[PDB]
Design a protein around this ligand. Sequence first.
Ligand SMILES: CC(C)(COP(=O)(O)OP(=O)(O)OC[C@H]1O[C@@H](n2cnc3c(N)ncnc32)[C@H](O)[C@@H]1OP(=O)(O)O)[C@@H](O)C(=O)NCCC(=O)NCCS
Length: 209
Amino acid sequence: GPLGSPYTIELIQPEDGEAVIAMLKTFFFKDEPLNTFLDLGECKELEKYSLKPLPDNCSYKAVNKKGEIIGVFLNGLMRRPSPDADSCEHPKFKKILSLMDHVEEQFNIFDVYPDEELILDGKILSVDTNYRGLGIAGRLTERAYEYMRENGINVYHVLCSSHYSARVMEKLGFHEVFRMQFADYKPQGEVVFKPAAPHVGIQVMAKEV
Ligand SMILES: CC(C)(COP(=O)(O)OP(=O)(O)OC[C@H]1O[C@@H](n2cnc3c(N)ncnc32)[C@H](O)[C@@H]1OP(=O)(O)O)[C@@H](O)C(=O)NCCC(=O)NCCS
């Protein structure tokens, strides 16, 4: 069973795109809480969204003895915003993107870390259901620390839409620096998202490595 089983942690390469997408379609596309709530289904926009940060060379896969991807954490570099969703044609993903834009409008991680210019952003985290509860997500997260140290990056920022991913980060010493309860997210005056308990809100997590 999964409990005894070895896996490696490896850098995700460009040619890994299709394998990453196939895994995410089985898992993340269906079981990330906002995706679950909306019943996302087929979503090319999220596929492209997931592939986008790969060239930053700081995304990692967990791979079992059969050579199958059993977990991923896709990360990209994020830069201090300057003062200076709309083109998304997938109606369900558009709502998710709008929420993400809203969080950014309400909270700027660079205000918490005024001396930082570049921060690591943990964008997509997914572990095969069969292998959950083994700390794989934590292993994937810790792998990025090596990248951060090599590159003089001090802060790892992870926006969580799951209470379970928030727990992964909490175990690693990330702190929740901003919360937006789904019940309070009322653009145009009405609740857009009501995901299943215990997923009560967006939990923005930050680690100073
Ligand atoms: C979030 C996720 C990546 C965690 O991966 P993981 O490798 O299982 O992480 P952990 O082993 O540290 O488990 C974290 C918590 O998940 C919870 N959990 C949820 N389902 C579980 C299950 N099937 N098995 C065991 N734990 C589970 C546990 O509360 C656990 O906390 P604990 O260590 O205090 O018991 C995984 O649950 C997942 O893929 N969820 C669906 C996609 C998603 O929501 N991604 C994050 C969006 S921000």
